[PDB]
Structures are given as C-alpha cells and as structure tokens.
Amino acid sequence: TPVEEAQQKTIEAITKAINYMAKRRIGALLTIERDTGMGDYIETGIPLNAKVSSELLINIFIPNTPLHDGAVIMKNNEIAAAACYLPLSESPFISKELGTRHRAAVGISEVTDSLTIIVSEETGGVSVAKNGDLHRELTEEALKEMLEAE
Amino acid sequence: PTPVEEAQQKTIEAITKAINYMAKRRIGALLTIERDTGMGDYIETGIPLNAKVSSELLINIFIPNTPLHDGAVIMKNNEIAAAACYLPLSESPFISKELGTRHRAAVGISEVTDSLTIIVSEETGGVSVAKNGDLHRELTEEALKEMLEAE
Ligand SMILES: O=C([C](F)N1[C]=N(F)[C]=N1)C1=[C][C]=[C][C]=[C]1
Numbered sequence: 001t002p003v004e005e006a007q008q009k010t011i012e013a014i015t016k017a018i019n020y021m022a023k024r025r026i027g028a029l030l031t032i033e034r035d036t037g038m039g040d041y042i043e044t045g046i047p048l049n050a051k052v053s054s055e056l057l058i059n060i061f062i063p064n065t066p067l068h069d070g071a072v073i074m075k076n077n078e079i080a081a082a083a084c085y086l087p088l089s090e091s092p093f094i095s096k097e098l099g100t101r102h103r104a105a106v107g108i109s110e111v112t113d114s115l116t117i118i119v120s121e122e123t124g125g126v127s128v129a130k131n132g133d134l135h136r137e138l139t140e141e142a143l144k145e146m147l148e149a150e
Numbered sequence: 151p152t153p154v155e156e157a158q159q160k161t162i163e164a165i166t167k168a169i170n171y172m173a174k175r176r177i178g179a180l181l182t183i184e185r186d187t188g189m190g191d192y193i194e195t196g197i198p199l200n201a202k203v204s205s206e207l208l209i210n211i212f213i214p215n216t217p218l219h220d221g222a223v224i225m226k227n228n229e230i231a232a233a234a235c236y237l238p239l240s241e242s243p244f245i246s247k248e249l250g251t252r253h254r255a256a257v258g259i260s261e262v263t264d265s266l267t268i269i270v271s272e273e274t275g276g277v278s279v280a281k282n283g284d285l286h287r288e289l290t291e292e293a294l295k296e297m298l299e300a301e
C-alpha cells in the first residue's frame with residue numbers, strides 16, 4: 001500500500017545515511033517520534049519539516065556545521081527539526097566509555113516510546129535507545145530489524 | 151506588516167546570513183529563487199526537500215564534498231523545494247571567461263525564467279546575481295540585500 005511503500009522508503013533512507021556515517025565515524029543522533037508526543041523537544045531545534053532523504057540526513061550531521069550538534073527528530077515521515085535538545089540520562093548502567101550523544105538518546109527513551117539511533121564519533125558503532133536501554137554494536141541487519149519492528 | 155511580509159523578511163535574512171557565511175569561507179553555492187515563471191521541471195531533477203528555510207540548512211546543504219552541495223538549491227517562497235538540481239548552462243559571451251559551471255548555470259536559468267539566482271564563487275568568495283540573462287558580480291552585502299528586497 002502507499003503507506004507501506006512510504007515507510008519502507010524512509011527506512012531505506014535512514015539505513016543508507018547511518019551506513020555512510022558509521023563508515024566515516026560521523027557522530028549522529030536521530031530520534032523517531034512514536035505515540036508519545038515530542039513537540040516540546042522539536043521546538044528546541046531548527047525547524048525543517050523536510051522530506052526524508054539519505055542525502056539530507058548526511059548533510060545535516062557533517063561535523064563542524066550549523067545543524068550537526070543535537071538531535072534530528074523525525075515525526076510523521078518527515079524530518080521535523082534538527083539540532084534539538086534531548087534530556088541526558090542519569091542511568092548508571094550506560095557503558096562508561098560513552099558520551100553525551102548516547103546519554104541524550106537513553107534520556108529521551110526513558111520518558112517517551114521513541115526510537116533513537118546513535119552513531120559514535122569515536123568508533124562509528126551504531127546503537128539504538130528504547131525504553132531506557134541502549135542496544136550497542138548493531139549490524140546493519142539488526143538496525144533494519146529494529147526499524148521494521150518499530 | 152502582514153504575516154506574508156514578515157515571512158518574506160525572515161527568508162531574506164536567512165538567505166543573506168547563509169550567503170555571507172559561505173562567501174567568507176569560499177563555499178561555492180548556487181541558489182535560485184523561483185518567481186512567477188514556474189520552475190517545477192528543474193525542481194524535479196533534484197533531491198526533494200520541501201523544507202522550511204533557515205540559514206543553517208542553506209549552509210549545511212552547500213558544505214563541500216557532501217551529497218547535496220553540487221547543483222542548484224531552488225526555493226519557492228519560504229521553502230527550500232529541492233537541492234542538487236540541474237539548471238541549463240548559458241552560452242552567453244558576457245560571462246567572464248574564468249567563471250565555472252555554477253555561474254553558467256545561473257545565467258542559463260535566468261534566460262528562460264524570471265527567477266533570481268545567487269552564486270558564491272568557490273575561487274574568490276565573490277557573490278553574484280543572475281537575472282534576465284545578466285550576471286552582476288562582486289556584490290556587497292548591502293547590494294545583495296537590496297536586490298532581494300526589491301525582488
Ligand atoms: O556501517 C558499518 C556497520 F557497522 N553498520 C551498522 N549499522 F547499523 C549500519 N552499518 C560499517 C561497515 C564497514 C566498516 C565499518 C562500519
């Protein structure tokens with residue numbers, strides 16, 4: 001169906017962008033709003049309300065650019081805003097080698113049902129935060145499975 | 151001022167801030183503003199964005215060696231319609247011979263539309279505008295803003 005084709009296209013755009021950033025070890029933080037509304041956090045960023053594309057996602061997160069600091073928040077199959085604030089988790093059970101991007105992802109996952117993808121700038125490793133837990137060192141296939149499950 | 155006029159002022163401010171940032175850093179850029187002649191055929195050659203304008207997004211689009219930096223950004227009113235778009239190349243003899251494809255593309259679209267195109271040179275950081283087949287080079291910040299306000 002049209003809705004199904006659009007969801008699969010968005011998943012492919014995300015995974016292609018994550019692949020490019022993982023390979024180059026470009027830090028990234030991408031939160032996908034689900035049932036819990038995230039308007040208060042969207043409002044902290046730069047409004048985009050843009051069509052999703054792998055190219056736009058990559059261009060957003062290039063280091064030392066205006067938009068790369070903070071989270072991209074996606075809502076209703078669009079990029080709602082970039083450079084958004086997310087709350088930092090105080091969970092003592094996050095790997096100590098991880099920094100602010102990962103704590104921000106876990107933090108938003110503690111108070112919403114959202115799914116957040118993180119690319120580490122140190123290693124290029126890909127992780128997902130959901131329900132207050134961080135799922136680390138994902139393969140491409142694991143990330144796709146999580147996006148399809150969500 | 152009406153909401154429409156205030157929105158236009160915000161868009162001009164966003165454009166001028168982005169152009170000034172890129173000029174200072176010799177970031178090449180090609181930004182066409184659609185006017186009354188529709189540019190859909192050219193918009194459809196690019197990557198669709200349909201995004202709200204911001205200086206931050208304009209700058210991010212043109213960062214060298216990124217997916218979106220080659221080709222034209224096309225704006226429709228207060229939106230970035232698409233990036234990495236094709237524009238036709240002008241054969242005009244009044245394009246300075248040292249200028250590259252971005253300037254030739256800007257003059258080219260200006261020959262078949264009433265659009266206004268801004269170009270930042272990656273060689274010199276100079277700012278130019280193409281309109282109605284004519285290229286106006288080495289614009290000051292003040293001149294660019296005046297051109298946009300008049301448009
Ligand atoms: O990229 C990547 C992976 F890991 N992935 C994950 N996800 F999730 C997506 N992708 C790579 C490849 C190769 C080399 C390095 C790196």
Ligand SMILES: [Mg+2]
Nearest residue numbers: 286287288289
């Ligand atoms: Mg002069």
